[PDB]
């Protein structure tokens, strides 16, 4: 097996999600089905899916195009809020593990109020007082530190409580903050927003209290260039600092498009992967709505291929992933007729790479991933899922497992693909078609016979029999192994009343009779073998039938005319033997008949055959 522990667990989860859609059940939450395995690994992966769920848990317009949802200002706004809610809660967990040694340890004693937690967080991260703080303290801590880390944790209420106990010190900041907490989308009114920004810009552009600086332009979304590096030293603190500063419809203003493009264009992977920590960059791209970038990026880490494919599937089963129309493009690209700030993922290629790894010895699991390509076609019109099953069968040669083995008793035990579509007639011909083009007739027959395509089964069975008609049928020979399959196809084609056009069909049952004629001839059962050839009315034995038999030879399958030489000789040698054992006249007359027939028929080795036939007739007299 080519699948690692983690990859295998995901496969099982994707089998469920397929079993549900294959039986018409409720469309379960894919993101939940993937996070179910994440908990079996380190929390590096669990915290990823947590971000994936929260970033995709946005009210969408079902049955709407992918590009439309992702271009709409409506959806683009909720992404920023879902991310900020993740950066705030994520930071809140950092504040817990900073005070208590373990999340469990914090829980048993009880998570304290965000206010008392933050206070018990300031104790550690600033034990001694910084001399540059302003506006005094509140219950033993600087008022601005409390406000910042409370807003950072996302509890505006806890921050407003701090403000209520410092009404005299904070001046007019109270009426401004109380408006920020009330107004939605973390924005103030243009009039009041103007009043505070100008005040900050007036004489507080450079204040000795960094926490004061941070809060002001987090509330006013100002000084976008100043990264407030004094308080936002971590990467998440930067993302959170900026997403609280982005704006929507000219100076000192930043928008999501600029920010998202500004980040990866100027400070690409190189900047965010110098510490050899891959998820850091992924979180930067995913929490900025650049899902295709983050997916391709994370898909290149050979250790995190599994995770990047699935986060692509989630975005794909939620009409959020922007697929690349052309299949000839690179993995990541920007369509020419699209804005430059969005990118597109060649989803078809993405799955095709992941599959090649475990498609060789783990076919069942491969199909589960090929199903997501059911909705796509290629330039030639083939259904992508169907084509992927053809290529996977041509390579793996797993016919019984994937296509269903058709035993020699008339049964068709369904295969693994039967689960996904009930119309399995084309691919069985596709797989049968190539194997036919590769001279693998004995297989192409079994495959064509699996799809009950007798036109092709009998055609190929005619080719495999004609060479072996006069041969000696011996144990385990190529004659027995082909005759016995032909008879197993004759019964199942009569018991089920199946037949190809009379040309293909007539020749097929005719060869089977001839194969019996030589099997009796090679055994010495002369009398019995003579009777068979007489029924077939293939070789004339009375002079009257020569005219009609000669005309019939003209339109009989060349697989029959080929073996005419051996038939005449065996029949002659049959009469020849019976002569040495009135009757003499009758054999003599029949001997003549064979000669005149052979004389009027142009066929294989007519030279040596016509001569031998004449000699055997002379010895009779």
């Amino acid at each position: 097996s080519s699948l690692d522990n983690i990859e295998m667990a995901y496969a099982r989860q994707i089998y469920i999600y397929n079993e549900k859609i294959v039986n018409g059940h409720l469309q379960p939450n894919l993101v939940d089905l993937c996070a179910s395995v994440a908990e079996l690994d380190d929390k590096s992966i669990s915290d990823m899916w947590t971000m994936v769920k929260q970033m995709t848990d946005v009210l969408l317009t079902p049955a709407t195009d992918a590009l439309k949802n992702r271009s709409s200002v409506e959806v683009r706004m909720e992404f920023v809020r879902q991310a900020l809610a993740y950066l705030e809660q994520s930071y809140k967990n950092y504040t817990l593990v900073t005070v208590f040694g373990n999340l469990h340890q914090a829980q048993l004693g009880g998570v304290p109020g965000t206010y008392q937690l933050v206070r018990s967080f300031l104790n550690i991260k600033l034990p001694a007082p910084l001399p540059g703080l302003q506006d005094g303290e509140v219950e033993g801590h600087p008022v601005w530190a409390l406000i910042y880390y409370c807003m950072r944790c996302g509890d505006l209420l806890a921050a407003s409580q701090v403000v209520n106990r410092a009404q005299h010190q904070l001046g007019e900041f109270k009426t401004w903050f109380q408006e920020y907490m009330n107004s939605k989308d973390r924005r103030l009114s243009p009039a009041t927003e103007n009043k505070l920004r100008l005040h900050y810009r007036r004489a507080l552009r450079n204040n000795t209290d960094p926490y004061k600086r941070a809060v002001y332009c987090i509330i006013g979304r100002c000084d976008v260039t100043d990264n407030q590096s004094e308080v936002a030293d971590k990467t998440e603190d930067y993302l959170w600092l900026k997403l609280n500063q982005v704006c929507f419809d000219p100076q000192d203003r930043l928008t999501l498009s600029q920010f998202q493009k500004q980040l990866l264009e100027d400070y690409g992977e190189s900047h965010f992967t110098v510490n050899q920590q891959p998820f850091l960059y992924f979180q930067v791209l995913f929490l900025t709505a650049q899902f295709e970038a983050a997916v391709a990026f994370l898909f290149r880490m050979e250790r995190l291929r599994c995770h990047a494919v699935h986060v692509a599937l989630v975005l794909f089963e939620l009409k959020l992933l922007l697929k690349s129309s052309g299949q000839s493009a690179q993995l990541l690209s920007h369509e020419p007729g699209d804005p430059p700030c969005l990118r597109r993922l060649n989803f078809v290629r993405l799955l095709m790479l992941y599959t090649r790894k475990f498609e060789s010895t783990d076919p069942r699991e491969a199909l589960q991933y090929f199903y997501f390509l059911r909705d796509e076609k290629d330039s030639q019109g083939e259904n992508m899922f169907l084509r992927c099953v053809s290529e996977l069968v041509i390579e793996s040669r797993e016919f019984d497992m994937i296509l269903g083995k058709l035993e020699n008793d008339g049964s068709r035990k369904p295969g693994v693909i039967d689960k996904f579509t009930s119309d399995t007639k084309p691919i069985i011909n596709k797989v049968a078609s190539v194997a036919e083009n590769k001279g693998l007739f004995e297989e192409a027959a079994k495959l064509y016979d699996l799809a009950k395509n007798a036109d092709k089964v009998l055609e190929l069975m005619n080719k495999l029999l004609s060479p072996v008609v006069p041969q000696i049928s011996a144990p385990q020979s190529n004659k027995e192994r082909l005759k016995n399959m032909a008879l197993s196809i004759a019964e199942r084609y009569r018991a089920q009343g199946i037949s190809a056009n009379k040309f293909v069909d007539s020749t097929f049952y005719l060869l089977l009779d001839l194969i019996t004629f030589f099997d009796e001839y090679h055994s010495g059962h002369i009398d019995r073998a003579f009777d068979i050839i007489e029924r077939l009315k293939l070789v004339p034995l009375n002079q009257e039938s020569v005219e009609e038999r000669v005309a019939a030879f003209r339109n009989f399958s060349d697989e029959i005319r080929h073996n005419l030489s051996e038939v005449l000789l065996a029949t002659m040698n049959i009469l020849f033997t019976q002569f040495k054992r009135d009757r003499d006249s009758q054999l003599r007359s029949q001997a003549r008949t064979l000669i005149t027939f052979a004389g009027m028929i142009p066929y294989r080795t007519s030279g040596d055959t016509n001569a031998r036939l004449v000699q055997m007739e002379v010895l009779m007299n």
Binding site: K20, V311, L313, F316
Partner: protein, 160 residues
Amino acid sequence: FEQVAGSLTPANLTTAVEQMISLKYYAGAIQLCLTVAQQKDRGNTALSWVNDGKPANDSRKKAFDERKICYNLIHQVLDKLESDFAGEPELVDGRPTLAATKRMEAYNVVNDSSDEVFHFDMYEWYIEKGWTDRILSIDSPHVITYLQRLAETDFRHAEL
């Protein structure tokens, strides 16, 4: 199948759709059902029979029933679609997954139809399943006009 849509029997249609559903061919399955519905009634005897209040004893009922068998099968397709992709994300690494694109491709075929009895049957279906999500988001008056007739009749419809 589409070339012989008008001749397809309920047994052959059902089996076909089911097989297509199993192979993740949702859009395709839906497109066949719509085509079959339109071919078994090109005069729209069904649309007029519904616009006339569905008078019992009338012989358009047959025409309406042959379309309802197609519409039901469409419900099964969409049902099995959300089921098969329950838990699957709509976006991975940024761009859309394959499970998402099949959802869009399927629902496209739905919103791309001009079969009116079909869209009525779908409004009723959305209401049934409880999807105030999508129905209140149509925009179209067609759905308003449809409700204006069915309002004085049912509480749930009047609320919509």
